[PDB]
Structures are given as structure tokens and as C-alpha cells.
Design a protein around this ligand. Structure first.
Ligand SMILES: O=C1NC(=O)[C@](CNC(=O)c2cnn(-c3cccc(F)c3)n2)(C2CC2)N1
Ligand SMILES: [Ca+2]
Ligand SMILES: [Ca+2]
Ligand SMILES: [Ca+2]
Ligand SMILES: [Cl-]
Ligand SMILES: [Zn+2]
Ligand SMILES: [Zn+2]
Length: 158
């Protein structure tokens, strides 16, 4: 698959989940981008106007792309690999209950996984990997990418 042919990447939060405080949503997303920028040459910037590379969206059901969300449970989010338009964008299922910790589905951890896809990673067979298919909560205070994750992203971006 493709990679981003540039190191300065922008994101915009299209809309905010009513589940969380807006500042917590901003924080979770910013910290998620930071995870990946720490291990790559990529720099992520939040923009408030115009078209961003990565649009962050909360939506439910069929929401205008090829893939409808499915209510509470099952699919938590999806994202599109590098490219123009919908490429890079990360969509979070509003039928989930997004939380700062483990009360519902953790937005930070979900966002790390989705951003990985936005940057061109597929899934990992390592259960320790953030790119493993199955969501599970981990202590976010001790959160780190696996060796499988770091190798994955550095093979794409150095
Ligand atoms: O992005 C996606 N890839 C997929 O295969 C689906 C299903 N998976 C999920 O909804 C999802 C979201 N986050 N996590 C997760 C996993 C492991 C650790 C972690 F921190 C978060 N899994 C599918 C394409 C709809 N969406
Ligand atoms: Ca895009
Ligand atoms: Ca769902
Ligand atoms: Ca919700
Ligand atoms: Cl919580
Ligand atoms: Zn979507
Ligand atoms: Zn995935």
C-alpha cells in the first residue's frame, strides 16, 4: 500500500462526540498522534479551518462512505490509508461510548490504532501490538507501542 509523501501532516476534528468533554477529545487525539510522531519523522498539526490531511469524524450507521457502522459493539472505528480526499481520514462509531479511561471504549487507544491505518499500517498478529485486531484496554499511563508496531511504522517512514 501507499505512504504519505510528506512529513508535515495536518488533522482536523470534524465534529465532537457528546460522550466526552471537548478538551478530553482534543487531548486523546493529540496524544494519539504524538505516539506515532515519537517513532517517525512525521509531524502532526491540528488545524481549525480548510482541508486537513486527516479528518477525524464521529458518526453512526451509514455515514457517506462505503462502510456503515454497526451500532454499539463490533466495529469501533475505521480509517483510510494515505491518499487524497477520504484518504487518511479516521471515523469513530458514535454508537460506542467514548471515555477518557475504561468506562466505555477508550478514545486514545482507539485513535492510536486508527492513526496507524491512516499512516498505512495493516493489522498485526502480535497480541501486544496496538495494531492487533482485538481492542482491549491497557493502562494508558504505561502505554507504549510494541516492537512489532515500531518496526511496522519505521519500514514505511524510516
Ligand atoms: O480499524 C479497524 N480495523 C479493523 O479491522 C476494524 C475493526 N477494529 C476496530 O474497530 C478497532 C478499533 N480500535 N481497535 C483496537 C485494537 C487493538 C488495540 C487498540 F488499542 C484498538 N480495534 C474494521 C475495519 C472496521 N476497524
Ligand atoms: Ca483525507
Ligand atoms: Ca460499533
Ligand atoms: Ca456515543
Ligand atoms: Cl472512563
Ligand atoms: Zn466512515
Ligand atoms: Zn484495524
Amino acid at each position: 500500500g501507499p505512504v504519505w509523501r510528506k512529513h508535515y501532516i495536518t488533522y482536523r476534528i470534524n465534529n465532537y462526540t457528546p460522550d466526552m468533554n471537548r478538551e478530553d477529545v482534543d487531548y486523546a487525539i493529540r496524544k494519539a498522534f504524538q505516539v506515532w510522531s515519537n517513532v517517525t519523522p512525521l509531524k502532526f498539526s491540528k488545524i481549525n479551518t480548510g482541508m486537513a490531511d486527516i479528518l477525524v469524524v464521529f458518526a453512526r450507521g451509514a455515514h457517506g462512505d462505503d462502510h456503515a457502522f454497526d451500532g454499539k459493539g463490533g466495529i469501533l472505528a475505521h480509517a483510510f490509508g494515505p491518499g487524497s480526499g477520504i484518504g487518511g481520514d479516521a471515523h469513530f462509531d458514535e454508537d460506542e461510548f467514548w471515555t477518557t479511561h475504561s468506562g466505555g471504549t477508550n478514545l486514545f487507544l482507539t485513535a492510536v490504532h486508527e492513526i496507524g491505518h491512516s499512516l498505512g499500517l495493516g493489522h498485526s498478529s502480535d497480541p501486544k501490538a496496538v495494531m492487533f485486531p482485538t481492542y482491549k484496554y491497557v493502562d494508558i499511563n504505561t502505554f507504549r507501542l510494541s516492537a512489532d508496531d515500531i518496526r511496522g511504522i519505521q519500514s514505511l517512514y524510516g
